[PDB]
Design a protein around this ligand. Sequence first.
Ligand code: A1AJR
Ligand code: A1AJR
Ligand code: CL
Length: 163
Amino acid sequence: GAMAPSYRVKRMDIAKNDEECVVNAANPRGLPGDGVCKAVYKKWPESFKNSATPVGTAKTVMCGTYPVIHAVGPNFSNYTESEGDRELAAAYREVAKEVTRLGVNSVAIPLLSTGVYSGGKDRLTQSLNHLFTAMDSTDADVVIYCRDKEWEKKISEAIQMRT
Ligand SMILES: c1cnc2c(c1)NCCC2
Ligand SMILES: c1cnc2c(c1)NCCC2
Ligand SMILES: [Cl-]
């Protein structure tokens, strides 16, 4: 575990992370995809061997010895708000199981279902709160990756609020 497990946020490409493993915002079919998934495909293409997994699950595949945790958030275009919320919570619980199993001291994680899968809604608070519910009981250093300057401030404020 980390000596004083923390949450941090960085605004940059998750393919440049400084952590012991990465969570991919994957699609269920293990396809290269877009956004976080395409950056992950470019950096760790070997990790997409047999990475297909259902919605609400995570499947880890090694790129050399570096673990890529493929986490499949729901596409809110297809799910009801209610069923989408259940699957988004579930995907993060499966990420916490994998991070624990791998014995890493740190993990890079994007906010699931906040981009192309958001159904055109702002889901920062919803996705971040499911991330916390899952990860609070782990002792890995969690580093959250985002792209948007305003999201960086809101994530930073949410982390600081609880400290
Ligand atoms: C997250 C992912 N990609 C990028 C950024 C952040 N910032 C700059 C351009 C590329
Ligand atoms: C491409 C690569 N990394 C990231 C993104 C896109 N979007 C969210 C933050 C991390
Ligand atoms: Cl997304």
